[PDB]
Specification:
heterotrimer, A: 81 residues, alpha+beta, Ubiquitin-like (UB roll), five-stranded mixed β-sheet, 17% helix, 33% strand, B: 74 residues, mainly alpha, Single alpha-helices involved in coiled-coils or other helix-helix interfaces, 3 helices, 0% strand, Ubiquitin-like protein MDY2 (chain A)
Chain lengths: 81, 74, 74
């Protein structure tokens, strides 16, 4: 299992630690954020990995989760007024 | 040391520059997207609005004097 | 309009300034964290390393004239 720490800067902010699969998709993360009432739509979400940008249908084995980081910055735009 | 560049000035310059860069698409597609998202977060980091550019910078010749004591130019 | 500034220079100025911002800690810890991730984002976008700032900026007076067509400075 790969350790991924989700660190959301913008409000609502949060920092959750979870284990994902090597063949896991970033889409799963996005869905999890919405299911936790932390995100509005997947379309308004972008994950940052120490400068390195991640894509919606991207896989952890593609972007390569750097062990020297394991920190994923969560960027979301609220659609709810 | 003698860096007379204000953070608010630089911050506004960053968001200003990025916006004008995506305007003429002077960079890669995802590159522009990255600049936009970084700009948004930077605005939050400094607690200022991206649209406040003209309020902070304006046109008073924003000379961001920030050498960072770099004498290793060559 | 007549924006006489190179995106390379600006990019280097951002990552250079950011480095000095977290250096003296002129911003909140969380803010520094944000600027640190954004730093590599901008660096990756232009395909340059934050370590090349000296060779880019130097001290030859970085007159990055970038008005961005700002006339609403009143």
């Amino acid at each position: 299992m790969v350790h991924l720490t989700l660190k959301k800067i913008q409000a609502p902010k949060f920092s959750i630690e979870h284990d994902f699969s090597p063949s896991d998709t970033i889409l799963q993360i996005k869905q999890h954020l919405i299911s936790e009432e932390k995100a509005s739509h997947i379309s308004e979400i972008k994950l940052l990995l120490k400068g390195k940008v991640l894509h919606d249908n991207l896989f952890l084995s593609d972007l390569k989760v750097t062990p020297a980081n394991s920190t994923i910055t969560v960027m979301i735009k609220p659609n709810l007024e | 040391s003698v860096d007379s560049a204000s953070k608010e000035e630089i911050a506004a310059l960053i968001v200003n520059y990025f916006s004008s860069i995506v305007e003429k698409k002077e960079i890669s597609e995802d590159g522009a997207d990255s600049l936009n998202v970084a700009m948004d977060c930077i605005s939050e980091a400094f607690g200022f609005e991206r649209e406040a550019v003209s309020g902070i910078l304006g046109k008073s010749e924003f000379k961001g004097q920030h050498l960072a004591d770099i004498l290793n130019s060559a």
